[PDB]
Design a protein around this ligand. Structure first.
Ligand SMILES: COc1ccc(C2=NN(C(C)C)C(=O)[C@@H]3CC=CC[C@H]23)cc1-c1ccc(C(=O)N2CC[C@@H](O)C2)cc1
Ligand SMILES: [Mg+2]
Ligand SMILES: [Zn+2]
Length: 335
């Protein structure tokens, strides 16, 4: 909860010169991999996508966040992502872009206030800060120093509490405080809801978040504040597991990257003497198809179909695309 090094004029100018013609950052078919390949500075192009998405929405303007404070914030986030195969700055820009499509192509903006929409798009960019490509189980199973601190401290969401700490750190500088235009009660809601949503991305809480959302949607008018809170949690979670809702070739590129992080975690566990689950073990697997089908069947397809049928009807395309992708992997297996 303290200062960071100031963003410079030159760093800002390097983002502002990126052009992006022939991309539409609001479209469900937008391809971040093609955007990255189109230029020799893919980190500047990724920052420009986030900047143009947020400014194009009208939300920072509504809530007192200047163009310069928004760009500073995006660049402070970028500096705190690591060179890891999947949980990097590209993943969080992808989640931000995807949530924009759920809100404005899927019409989920009808269920939320404008302030809640602004907090969601901002939260997407902080939600994995300083991720080291290792999950909560790694830290606890191996007695790594952060696992010892979680054990002594109480909380088992090692990663997600860390991400929240760093978000608070970035927002402590007035030059990058995107919530500085909010007054009293609203500023408090913004921080509380950002923290709640990030803490809800721990997949150990996947089942309990889903059930609380479906219960709150069953009678919305009985408790409106609860329904709003849970809708924000469920949309960030949906963005976070959205790789299987994309055009097949895009979906496959994401799957390759996360698979490599799984294997590297297994390698590090084996080296520290722990007996690894076979999903994380290079020596126990071959092609991607069977694992993507398993992820779809046991996690993503029931999640998306349940939230769509419960009240998010405008997001039907996600279920259709998941089914299409699953059929493509199944054809790979059958041949
Ligand atoms: C698109 O693929 C994925 C997306 C998110 C995840 C995640 N799983 N999970 C749990 C469900 C295990 C997370 O906690 C991650 C962190 C936050 C949200 C979701 C993340 C896993 C896969 C996943 C990774 C690898 C395979 C796979 O095919 N493998 C992995 C190794 C071998 O079994 C082949 C399948 C699914
Ligand atoms: Mg995460
Ligand atoms: Zn994530």
């Amino acid at each position: 909860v303290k200062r960071v090094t100031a963003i410079t004029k030159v760093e800002r100018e390097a983002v502002l010169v990126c052009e992006l013609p022939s991309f539409d950052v609001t479209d469900v078919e937008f391809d971040l991999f093609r955007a990255r390949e189109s230029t020799d500075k893919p980190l500047d192009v990724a920052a420009a996508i986030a900047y143009r998405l947020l400014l194009g929405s009208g939300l920072p303007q509504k809530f007192g966040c200047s163009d310069e404070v928004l760009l500073n914030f995006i660049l402070q986030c970028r500096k705190k992502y690591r060179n890891v195969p999947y949980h990097n700055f590209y993943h969080v820009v992808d989640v931000c872009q995807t949530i924009h499509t759920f809100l404005y192509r899927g019409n989920v903006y009808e269920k939320l206030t404008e302030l809640e929409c602004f907090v969601l798009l901002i939260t997407a960019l902080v939600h994995d800060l300083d991720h080291m490509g290792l999950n909560n189980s790694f830290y606890l199973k191996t007695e790594s120093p952060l696992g010892i601190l979680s054990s002594a401290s109480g909380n088992t969401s090692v990663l997600e509490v860390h991400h929240c700490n760093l978000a608070v750190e970035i927002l402590s500088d007035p030059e990058s405080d995107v919530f500085d235009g909010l007054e009293g009660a609203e500023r408090t809601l913004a921080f509380r809801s950002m923290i709640d949503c990030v803490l809800a991305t721990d997949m150990a809480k996947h089942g309990s978040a889903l059930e609380a959302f479906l219960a709150s949607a069953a009678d919305q008018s009985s408790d409106e504040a609860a329904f709003h809170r849970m809708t924000m949690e469920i949309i960030l979670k949906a963005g976070d597991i959205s790789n299987v809702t994309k055009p097949f070739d895009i979906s496959r590129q994401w799957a390759m990257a996360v698979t490599e992080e799984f294997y590297r975690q297994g390698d590090m566990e084996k080296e520290r003497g722990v007996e690894v689950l076979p999903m994380f073990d290079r020596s126990k697997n071959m092609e991607l198809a069977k694992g993507q089908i398993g992820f779809i069947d046991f996690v993503a397809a029931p999640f998306f179909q349940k939230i769509v049928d419960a009240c998010l009807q405008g997001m039907q395309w996600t279920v259709d695309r998941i089914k299409s992708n699953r059929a493509q992997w199944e054809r790979v297996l059958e041949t």
